[PDB]
Design a protein around this nucleic acid. Structure first.
Ligand SMILES: Nc1ncnc2c1ncn2[C@H]1C[C@H](O)[C@@H](COP(=O)(O)OP(=O)(O)OP(=O)(O)O)O1
Ligand SMILES: [Ca+2]
Ligand SMILES: [Ca+2]
Ligand SMILES: [Cl-]
Ligand SMILES: [Cl-]
Ligand SMILES: [Cl-]
Ligand SMILES: [Cl-]
Ligand code: NA
Ligand code: NA
Ligand code: NA
Ligand code: NA
Length: 326
DNA sequence: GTCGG
DNA sequence: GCTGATGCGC
DNA sequence: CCGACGGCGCATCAGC
């Protein structure tokens, strides 16, 4: 793509700062910069040009001049050659191993996939599952498969209670031809901001999906959020489908629109929408949009009857899901 | 790392 | 058990 | 020119 060399470079720097440096604000700075550059409609030809964009400052502008002049960045060349950094970065690819766990593993001499398998006893349950399906979770999911997955989830939810509504969100809802995983937003009329009239609404759905062997493992699970693993059924003598990551959020039925806005993403789109909201004097989460007071305290939830309502409050033109991708 | 209080 | 902090993740 | 940057669920640990 246009400016892909530059946005690749900045994404790699972002990942180095989060995973190795543990500098989460530099991670965010690089991600914002990558994002704005990715949506910039001209081929960037100097650092000075790039510096005019919001989120690009002096330091990223120098890097862009170096990349443009040379087709590489010396900082990144040195990072790539650093075995310890590469091992730390690599270990974070495992679900359940973040930057802190990865550094401790590498410090203890665990630097490779083989090292992890020989040291399963040092891993928690989440990390064990992450390791077990490491190869599978690196793969993306074709939209054709996401459609078969949607069909199974929606059917099984219907069988538990026809009053449930399940909506497949994330990249899928944004129209992507492939997805990293499956995110399902769940609502039921017995769960609203005003009451919990039935117990175990999420649990009921999870156990039915387990019963039919669609959900195969659990990474975490509470009353509102399930994080786990699932798999499509496959035909005789045919290779198995990869195991996939699945997340299910149960949101109060009356907060559906803030819910689907959040769960539709992208992640960068949400953080920029929420930042804009803040400077328009609002705070947004997956439940509500509320006005900000002088103390800093959030007011009461504002009425919302559509995704577009949320955009209107902060004076954004509506963006369809497909225009919320990076 | 960037931008603003 | 709790509150608060951290780690991991959406 | 130093300090703030979306927002939150679940799991685990520290210090009660
Ligand atoms: N840091 C964050 N802040 C706000 N919202 C987030 C954040 N991370 C994830 N989300 C929201 C937006 C995401 O689209 C949604 C589902 O997350 P996730 O599955 O991780 O990514 P995704 O569906 O956008 O892309 P992918 O195809 O890689 O899964 O949750
Ligand atoms: Ca997803
Ligand atoms: Ca997800
Ligand atoms: Cl930082
Ligand atoms: Cl479970
Ligand atoms: Cl809503
Ligand atoms: Cl709220
Ligand atoms: Na700038
Ligand atoms: Na990880
Ligand atoms: Na169907
Ligand atoms: Na199996």
């Amino acid at each position: 793509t246009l400016n892909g060399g530059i946005t690749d470079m900045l994404t790699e720097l972002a990942n180095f700062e989060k995973n190795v440096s543990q500098a989460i604000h530099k991670y965010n700075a690089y991600r914002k910069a990558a994002s704005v550059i990715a949506k910039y409609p001209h081929k960037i030809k100097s650092g000075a040009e790039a510096k005019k964009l919001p989120g690009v400052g002096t330091k990223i502008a120098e890097k862009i001049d170096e990349f443009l002049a040379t087709g590489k960045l010396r900082k990144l060349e040195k990072i790539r050659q650093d075995d310890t950094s590469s091992s730390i970065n690599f270990l974070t690819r495992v679900s359940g191993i973040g930057p802190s766990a990865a550094r401790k593993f590498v410090d203890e001499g665990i630097k490779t996939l083989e090292d992890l398998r020989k040291n399963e006893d040092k891993l928690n349950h989440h990390q064990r599952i992450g390791l077990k399906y490491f190869g599978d979770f690196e793969k993306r999911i074709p939209r054709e498969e996401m459609l078969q997955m949607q069909d199974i989830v929606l059917n099984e939810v219907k069988k538990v209670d026809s009053e449930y509504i399940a909506t497949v969100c994330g990249s899928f809802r944004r129209g992507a031809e492939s997805s990293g995983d499956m995110d399902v937003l769940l609502t039921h009329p017995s769960f609203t901001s005003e009451s919990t009239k039935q117990p175990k609404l999420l649990h009921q759905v999870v156990e039915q999906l387990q019963k039919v062997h669609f959900i195969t493992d659990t990474l975490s699970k509470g009353e509102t959020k399930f994080m786990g693993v699932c798999q499509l059924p496959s035909k005789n003598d045919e290779k198995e489908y990869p195991h996939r990551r699945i997340d299910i959020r149960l949101i109060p039925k009356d907060q559906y629109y803030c819910g689907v806005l959040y769960f539709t993403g992208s992640d960068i789109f949400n953080k920029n929408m929420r930042a804009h909201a803040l400077e328009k004097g609002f705070t947004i989460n997956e439940y509500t949009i509320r006005p900000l007071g002088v103390t800093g305290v959030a007011g009461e939830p504002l009425p919302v009857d559509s995704e577009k309502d949320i955009f209107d409050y902060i004076q954004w033109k509506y963006r369809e899901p497909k225009d919320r991708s990076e």
